[PDB]
Write a protein that binds this DNA or RNA. Structure first.
Ligand SMILES: [Zn+2]
Length: 253
DNA sequence: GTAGACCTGGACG
DNA sequence: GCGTCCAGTCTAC
């Protein structure tokens, strides 16, 4: 659900760190609510698309959250239905941590026990420590850049809106092989990765709408027809790809 | 296994 | 503005 989205969720968690969990609800099968209640939320960490919560009385237990298309974290607030589905049923949170003075609700998310966190901001596109050397080394391989950009090892937080928009901003075709691009090209691509993700975050802190340049658009800024197709491994959830053949000619061998 | 809703912003008509 | 569409986890079958 993109790395800016996870930074927001982590921030919503932050004021509850250090409080006793009083009651635990939600519909999730796996996580026995009788492991959390009356422990303290003693740490919260975010890395790329993952959120890690630690529970203990200090090391401790870690719950990892990985969110779906409609996944969300909500602070002392419930989501509700606004109209009838084509065939009004409110969404059911998967986990709720209740504190003495508020709660956190977790929706449309796989939640599981883990040994701990893996939170390193070298591989994280929004962190100050984002390691562009390793990102470039990943981008230069003989693979379409649109595939490599989604590798969370090098671009933690990069999802489909970022993929599609930055490829347009760099005027790079999504099937161009990183090995057939110039070093200047891939430098512009990294610049746009960082700039666009940060700008989107700025728009999100205010209530400003993010307007797509290529993503889900019929025409490009120049007025061309935008092509849409799906590329990558069949497991992938971000195969959908928008591009303008005119502004993003495929670089050739 | 497959088919599809999703409480929703952003983009169309 | 008004209406409609659709883009990881979960459910139905
Ligand atoms: Zn164009």
């Amino acid at each position: 659900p993109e790395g800016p989205s996870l930074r927001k969720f982590h921030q919503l968690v932050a004021p509850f760190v250090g409080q006793l969990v009083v009651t635990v609800g939600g519909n999730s099968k796996k996580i026995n609510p009788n492991m959390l209640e009356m422990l303290r939320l003693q740490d919260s960490q975010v890395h790329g698309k993952n959120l890690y919560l630690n529970f203990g009385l200090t090391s401790g237990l870690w719950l990892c959250f990985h969110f779906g298309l409609f996944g969300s974290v909500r602070a002392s607030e419930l989501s509700r239905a606004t109209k009838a589905n084509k065939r009004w049923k409110d969404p059911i949170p998967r986990l709720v941590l209740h504190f003495a003075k508020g709660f956190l609700a977790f929706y449309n998310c796989r939640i599981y026990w883990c040994l701990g966190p893996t939170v390193k901001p070298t591989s994280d596109i929004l962190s100050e420590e984002f390691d562009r050397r390793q990102a470039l080394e990943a981008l230069k391989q003989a693979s379409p850049v649109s595939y490599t950009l989604l590798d969370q090892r090098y671009f933690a937080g990069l999802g489909n809106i970022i993929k599609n928009e930055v490829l347009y901003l760099a005027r790079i075709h999504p099937l161009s092989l990183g090995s057939c691009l110039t070093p200047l090209n891939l430098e512009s691509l990294l610049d746009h990765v960082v700039s666009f993700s940060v700008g989107w975050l700025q728009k999100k802190l205010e209530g400003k709408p993010l307007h797509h340049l290529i993503y889900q658009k019929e025409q490009c800024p120049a007025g061309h027809q935008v092509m849409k197709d799906s590329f990558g491994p069949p497991g992938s959830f971000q195969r959908l790809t928008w591009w303008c053949p005119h502004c993003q000619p495929k670089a050739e061998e």
